[PDB]
C-alpha cells in the first residue's frame, strides 16, 4: 500500500531556495520582483550545477 506519494528532492532546487532567502531580505517591492525573475530564468537555463555555493553573500 503505497498510499501517499513519496519522492526524493533535487539538490538543484536548493539554489532557488537561496533566491527566496535573498529576495525576502531585500527591501522595497521592485527588488523582490527581479531577483525571483532572474533566478527562474537561471534555473531553467542551467537546470543543475552545484548543490551548494557561496558568491552573492558577504563573509564580512
Contact 22, 56 (CB under 8 A): yes
If one counts every other C-beta atom within 10 angstroms of the C-beta of residue 43, the result is 15
* 15 HSE (CA, 13 A, CB side): 21
- Using CB atoms within 10 A of its CB, is residue 12 exposed (0-12), middle (13-18) or buried (19+)? middle
Technique used: NMR
Measure the CA dihedral 28/30/31/37, to 10°.
150
Residues 6+ apart with CB under 8 A from 53: 15
Residue 42 has which C-alpha cell?
A: 537561471
Measure the CA dihedral 22/25/31/32, to 10°.
70
Domain hosting 28: range is 1-60
Q: How many domains does the chain have?
A: 1
Amino acid at each position: 500500500g503505497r498510499g501517499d506519494e513519496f519522492s526524493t528532492h533535487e539538490p538543484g532546487e536548493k539554489r532557488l531556495s537561496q533566491c527566496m532567502k535573498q529576495c525576502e531580505r531585500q527591501d522595497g517591492g521592485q527588488q523582490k520582483q527581479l531577483c525571483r525573475f532572474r533566478c527562474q530564468e537561471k534555473y531553467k537555463k542551467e537546470r543543475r550545477e552545484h548543490s551548494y555555493s557561496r558568491d552573492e553573500e558577504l563573509e564580512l
